[PDB]
Design a protein around this nucleic acid. Structure first.
Ligand SMILES: [Zn+2]
Length: 609
RNA sequence: AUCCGGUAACGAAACUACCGGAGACGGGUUAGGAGGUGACGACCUCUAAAACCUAGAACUUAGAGUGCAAAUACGAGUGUAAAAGCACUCUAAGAGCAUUAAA
């Protein structure tokens, strides 16, 4: 199906009287989720010491959906398991609640208190979607960063054994290629002979214990290794940021928040008068009943049911009487070949400052089902995606780069940091956050080190949340998104004007050949008439205005256009070995001075030609 | 304090130096422009804002328009009688979120 999102400010969307409830709901959601994540993280660490190496008669611990749900109940002070019924399958899961409950007592050094976290509002339903995001986070972190752990462990070992820090990466790469394509890998799972990549995607939980072991050794085993090389990772993600996070609100969730039995009667009377049908609702919880019993008759089609959801939002929100409704009232973009029509999807995501609207295709609205010759005339350009500079563009006679500093100035980097320090320093919390908490780095995986950090934060949790609850922090969170487009769009506009006119010089770039001059003199007047090369190593928005192509990156930083062989290496022969100075290693070269951007970008463009 | 461009010492740097332009989130609070002598200044008026305070808005780029701010001479050496910037309407091209995280 087709799904799209629209992001706008939340001002005016909610009614004035109901605005207070929404604001307070966000605070409770962040506190419960943040505390729950720490409790879950601590529990898993204890399981690591329970059995390692793993036994052959038991399966690895995999976190299920109800694990996080029980954790939230413990935080709120629930005294008994939420499990319903008795059966062989629930024999083990029932006892797990007691173990987790005991762990919560062990984490803190004081008697648990219930009302320090409970809230009178019934915000249980909202927490349902927040759990899903955390669960999916573990899979993404394990699969993506697994290869990084392997290289670092081998890299640290080489450094410890006295081997030079230059060949350590090469040695690690050789081992990594063989195993991927001694104790850092398990036995091959798939019997079909496929590479280990398929095995990694088969299940991420199997490899999670291995990463935990790697981190523990890195903290203490490699004492002599330099601090810079020992960059600790976070195999177990957890919500550490104190800033409130976003939440998802649906029709069922919205009713549980704002609807009340006394106020419910007003909705029933309004619906009956305006539609002539009386709802079969007698209590607040009856609003979640199936469509069959709501009216006593069944809908003729799936799209009919969707219309019911839309009207519910109108009563509790100014959906059709707000400024933002202009872009959601069946607006069709000018450049859609299919002429698709979109409408509100009865879903809202907000954090109290910014609101994101979910809009789906009209054709699929309701109950969804289960789920070449242009190169001759076009002007050619190449790119060399580096690290210091996000992107670089060359044409054989001049170069332009999108430096990291350019984005920093556009995003108001200095102001954001300046404002944050001053506001926090007013309450005196700066010393505790930096001087104290820095001694107990959160990325540590040992139970003892983590326990010290966990209890320390709990003591100052009340003060920290109030200080970080100021909207100023969230305002900057929206500012970066708004300014991100401006920084990227302006650079793309500069690209057109940079090469719109024929180059005014023909001899400054001595390395330029006859072919380079022929392409430079070409005149362009449209965005789509320019073709920009790209490499395997931001491209989402660039392709929307300019056509792109892929070029191999093999040996693109050593080859030279007018030499018998590779001649590019780091500059030598001077007392100072500067950061990015490059000098040719032979006199038979068109140019003796080179830099990272021009040296690599020029070769990429040459291959395209 | 930083970004961009040029200049040499064979498309050279976080210092090898110099020169010409941008910019410091929103609101209240300071110095610059224009005008009762569009001569300077004597006296006032419209806009605007670095340091400080503060629970506080906004979909993005190229261009086209409208709409703003009012109070030297004649004569019998002599008396006196449009800029910075901002707001709105348009055209063209775009328009999917929440987070974990790093060489
Ligand atoms: Zn060469």
């Amino acid at each position: 199906s087709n799904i799209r999102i629209v992001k706008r400010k939340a001002k005016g969307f909610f009614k004035c009287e109901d605005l207070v409830t929404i604001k307070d709901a966000v605070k409770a959601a962040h506190r419960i989720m943040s505390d729950a994540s720490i409790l879950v993280r601590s529990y898993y660490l204890r399981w690591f010491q329970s059995s390692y190496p793993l036994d052959s008669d038991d399966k690895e611990l995999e976190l299920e959906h109800f694990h996080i749900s029980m954790a939230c109940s413990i935080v709120q002070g629930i005294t008994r398991p939420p499990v319903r019924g008795v059966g062989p399958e629930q024999s083990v899961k029932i006892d797990v609640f007691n173990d987790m409950l005991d762990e919560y007592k062990r984490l803190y050094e004081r008697a648990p208190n219930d009302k320090e976290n409970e809230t009178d509002l019934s915000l249980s339903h909202v927490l349902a979607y927040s759990i899903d995001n955390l669960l999916t986070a573990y899979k993404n972190n394990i699969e993506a960063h697994f290869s990084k752990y392997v290289k670092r462990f081998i890299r640290c070992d080489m450094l410890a054994k006295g081997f030079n820090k230059s060949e350590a990466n090469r040695v690690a790469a050789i081992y990594t290629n063989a195993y991927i394509y001694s104790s850092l890998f398990p036995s091959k799972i798939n019997k079909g002979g496929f590479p280990r990549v398929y095995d990694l995607k088969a299940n991420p939980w199997v490899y999670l214990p291995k990463m935990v072991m790697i981190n523990q050794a890195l903290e203490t085993d490699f004492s002599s290794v330099e601090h810079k090389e020992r960059r600790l990772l976070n195999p177990l993600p957890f919500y550490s940021s104190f800033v409130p996070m976003h939440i998802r609100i649906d029709t069922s969730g919205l009713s549980q928040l704002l609807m009340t039995k006394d106020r419910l009667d007003d909705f029933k009377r309004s619906y009956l008068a305006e539609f002539g049908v009386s709802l079969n609702i007698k209590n607040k919880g009856d609003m979640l009943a199936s469509f069959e019993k709501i009216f006593g008759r069944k809908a003729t089609s799936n799209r009919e049911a969707g219309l019911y959801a839309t009207e519910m939002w109108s009563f509790l929100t100014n959906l059709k009487t707000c400024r933002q409704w202009k872009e959601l009232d069946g607006v069709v973009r000018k450049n859609d070949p299919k002429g698709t029509q979109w409408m509100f999807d009865n879903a809202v995501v907000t954090d109290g400052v910014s609101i994101s609207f979910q809009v789906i295709d009209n054709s699929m609205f309701g109950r969804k089902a289960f789920s070449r010759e242009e190169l001759k005339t076009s002007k050619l350009l190449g790119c060399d995606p580096g690290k210091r500079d996000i992107l670089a563009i060359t044409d054989g006679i001049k170069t332009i780069c999108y430096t990291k500093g350019q984005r920093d100035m556009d995003t108001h980097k200095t102001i954001r940091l300046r404002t944050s320090l001053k506001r926090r320093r007013g309450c005196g919390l700066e010393e505790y956050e930096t001087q104290v908490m820095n001694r107990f780095q959160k990325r540590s995986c040992h139970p003892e080190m983590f326990r010290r950090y966990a209890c320390s934060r709990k003591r100052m949790e009340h003060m920290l949340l109030e200080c970080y609850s100021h909207p100023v922090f969230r305002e900057f969170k929206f500012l970066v998104y708004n300014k991100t487009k401006s920084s990227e769009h302006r650079f793309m506009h500069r690209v057109l004007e940079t090469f719109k006119r024929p180059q005014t010089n023909l001899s400054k770039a001595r390395c330029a050949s006859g072919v380079m001059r022929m392409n430079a003199l070409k005149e362009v007047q449209r965005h789509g008439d320019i073709i920009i090369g790209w490499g395997n190593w931001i491209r989402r928005r660039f392709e929307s205005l300019f056509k792109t192509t892929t070029v191999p990156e093999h040996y693109t930083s050593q080859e030279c256009p007018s030499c018998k062989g590779r001649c590019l290496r780091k500059a030598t022969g001077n007392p100072i070995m500067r950061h990015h100075l490059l000098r040719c290693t032979n006199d038979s070269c068109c140019s003796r001075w080179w830099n990272r951007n021009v040296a690599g970008a020029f070769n990429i463009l040459t291959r395209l030609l």
